[PDB]
Design a protein around this ligand. Structure first.
Ligand SMILES: [Zn+2]
Ligand SMILES: [Zn+2]
Ligand SMILES: [Zn+2]
Lengths: 46, 263, 41, 65
């Protein structure tokens, strides 16, 4: 269902805009990870 | 049948200890090289990654995937994607497989080649089936998953040769020896006190007659009688590695006579 | 009482939270159990 | 990280012998040399592959995320 960001610890898929600072829900981890892409990557098997 | 002559000693699904005789060292070698580098095979040569929360990197995993030996019995009934007239890959030139794994249990979940699943149409040719030789039908250990981690990949096997990448090699090693009794004097034994006492006598010294003390050097003897042993990796029956070795070498020279021709 | 300045703490010294941490306490904390710690951050 | 799939030098498949090797040691109380020979690793190039590997993944799996 989409997710622009993740949380450094609770893994809970966050996702907010501006003026939202940087915190998760209950896990005030001011960290947050950017979440992978859907544009699947191809790899040489070499 | 007049000419090169095979004389098998051991034989199994993995090795083929034999004795080539009545041939040029050059031919024993070219054949020896061909088996190592130019026998066609199928192998994963493209991995699309949907999900990898594993502890490894995509290219890291992908690299291993390619090293996983795949069924290449009817490899000739498959074409090189570069020759094929499709756009990229198709059933006429490629085998598609899938890998989906999830860390369900709390105990470490292992991912093996057996967990690979063919998704394309093999059209009746024995090809792409991940080789398995272990005593538990598991295959190669591709990765390990902790509870919660996931791995969703999509591979694409293609025909190739060792010259392009060692993953496409059907051979594992190739023992090769001649003149076990240093009679042609091709090598000069290094020693501290005694050549003979310091150098281990080889297997094949039994299959030959030790030179006699007073015989003058035989200067016209050439090199025939080569003791080989081929170890297959599984993607192909041992007997085949050899046979097709001779085959490809044969087609090679053929491609040349045909060059002078249409020249 | 009175607050007076801040003192940077050497990892794994009596003051640090890792000094008394078990192996698993270290993993959950994302700190390699192989780390020695005679430094500051 | 994990058992290399093959012997760097010859190509021998080795990534399918790690667990067996581990058992040959624990549950059978054998020695590494005797253990390795029973798995078929006869030439030292292949022997070193297994005898020298370090399974650091079993430590990576211990981190939560
Ligand atoms: Zn949080
Ligand atoms: Zn095609
Ligand atoms: Zn080896």
């Amino acid at each position: 269902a989409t997710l622009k960001y993740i949380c450094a610890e609770c893994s809970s898929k966050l996702s907010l805009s501006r003026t939202d600072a940087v915190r998760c829900k209950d896990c005030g981890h001011r960290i947050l990870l950017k979440a992978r892409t859907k544009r699947l990557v191809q790899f040489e098997a070499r | 049948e007049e000419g090169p002559q095979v004389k098998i000693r051991e034989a199994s699904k993995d090795n083929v200890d034999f004795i080539l005789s009545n041939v040029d060292l050059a031919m024993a070698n070219s054949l020896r090289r061909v088996m190592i580098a130019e026998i066609p095979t199928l192998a994963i040569d493209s991995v699309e990654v949907e999900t990898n929360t594993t502890v490894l990197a995509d290219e890291f995993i992908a690299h291993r995937l390619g090293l996983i030996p795949l069924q290449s019995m009817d490899i000739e009934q498959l074409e090189y994607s570069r020759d094929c007239f499709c756009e990229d890959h198709c059933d006429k030139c490629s085998v598609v497989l899938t890998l989906q794994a999830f860390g369900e249990s709390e105990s470490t979940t292992n991912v093996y080649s057996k967990d690979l699943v063919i998704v394309s149409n093999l059209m009746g040719r024995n090809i792409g089936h991940p080789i398995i030789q272990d005593k538990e039908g598991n295959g190669v250990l591709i990765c390990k998953l902790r509870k919660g981690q996931e791995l969703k990949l999509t591979c694409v096997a293609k025909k190739g040769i060792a010259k392009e990448h060692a993953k496409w090699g059907p051979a594992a090693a190739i023992e090769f020896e001649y003149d076990p009794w240093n009679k042609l004097k091709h090598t000069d034994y290094w020693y501290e006190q005694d050549s003979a006492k310091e150098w281990p006598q080889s297997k094949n010294c039994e299959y030959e007659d030790p030179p006699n003390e007073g015989d003058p050097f035989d200067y016209k003897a050439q090199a025939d009688t080569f003791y080989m042993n081929v170890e297959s990796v599984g993607s192909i029956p041992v007997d085949q590695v050899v046979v097709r070795g001779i085959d490809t070498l044969q087609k090679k020279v053929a491609s040349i006579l045909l060059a002078l021709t249409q020249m | 009482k009175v607050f007076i300045g801040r003192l940077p703490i050497m990892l794994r010294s009596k003051n640090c939270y890792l000094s008394e941490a078990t192996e698993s306490d270290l993993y959950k904390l994302k700190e390699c159990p192989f780390d020695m710690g005679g430094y500051f951050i | 990280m994990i058992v290399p799939v093959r012997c760097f030098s010859c190509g021998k498949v080795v990534g399918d012998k790690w667990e067996s090797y581990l058992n040959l040691l624990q549950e059978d109380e054998l020695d590494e040399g005797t253990a390795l020979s029973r798995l078929g690793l006869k030439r030292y190039c292949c022997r070193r592959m297994i005898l020298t590997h370090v399974d650091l993944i079993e430590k990576f799996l211990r981190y939560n995320p």
